[PDB]
């Protein structure tokens, strides 16, 4: 045949892949963690958004740290041979490097390690996307007026907020990041490469949202998401044929 290029992931396997959504709303009283009003709006928006991208969505609600680890392990031991990609969305409390189960923390490294190139062979060379709506610390952004591959290759972490910062969730509308992510996927997934979609998400969150609080410490604050890409190819959710 004619000349060929391979700068984009093959996304025309029989299946797009799994989209695992972990939606932690209610936490064990002993943890002291508040209930995450608005997160069901996020989980429903994500389910519909990834459904329309032809992902096999599995929604899970209010999982303990043990259940999160068991779920991830089990999913990583499935045969993904016929799947183009893998998506995991985490909606919870967090801090830097950590996501909360309903009864305590989970190391993000533990979750993602199950999908390493050497540990989930049917996803080797395929994009593994982790979308994380959770705090990463307690900083607030005041704004300003205007023949081997690496085992960590082919991961993408779409973080809702900059390292060290809180992340903002609206109890009525959902989180700023997930709201914006689903809107940009709906508008551009048939048009733009994924990093360019996520850059539009960055701009939407940065420009269209600002917190409102009766507490001056938490009022008029801003947010920028953080794209953490170790992908080796361009990622389009569509394919040609």
């Amino acid at each position: 045949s004619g000349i060929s290029l391979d700068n984009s992931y093959k996304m025309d396997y029989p299946e797009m892949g799994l989209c695992i959504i972990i939606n932690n709303k209610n936490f064990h009283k002993s943890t002291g963690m508040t209930s995450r009003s608005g997160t069901d709006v996020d989980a429903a928006n994500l389910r519909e958004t990834f459904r329309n991208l032809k992902y096999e969505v599995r929604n899970k609600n209010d999982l303990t740290r043990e259940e999160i680890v068991e779920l991830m392990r089990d999913v990583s031991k499935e045969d993904h041979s016929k799947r183009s990609s893998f998506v995991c969305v985490l909606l919870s409390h967090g801090e830097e490097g950590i996501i909360f189960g309903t009864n305590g923390p989970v190391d993000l490294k533990k979750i993602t390690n199950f999908f390493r190139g050497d540990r989930c062979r049917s996803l080797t060379g395929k994009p593994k996307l982790f979308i994380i709506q959770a705090c990463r610390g307690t900083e607030l952004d005041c704004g300003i007026e205007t023949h081997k591959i690496p085992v960590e290759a082919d991961f993408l972490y779409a973080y809702s907020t900059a390292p060290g910062y809180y992340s903002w969730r609206n109890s009525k509308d959902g989180s700023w990041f997930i709201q914006s992510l689903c809107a940009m996927l709906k508008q551009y997934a048939d048009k733009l490469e994924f990093m360019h979609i996520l850059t539009r998400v960055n701009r939407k969150v940065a420009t269209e949202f600002e917190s409102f609080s009766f507490d001056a410490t938490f009022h008029a604050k801003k947010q920028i998401p953080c794209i953490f890409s170790m992908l080796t190819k361009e990622l389009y959710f569509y394919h040609l044929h």
């Binding site: 995450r36 809180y166 992340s167």
Partner: peptide, 4 residues
């Protein structure tokens, strides 16, 4: 608006 609430923080996560």
């Amino acid at each position: 608006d609430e923080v996560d």
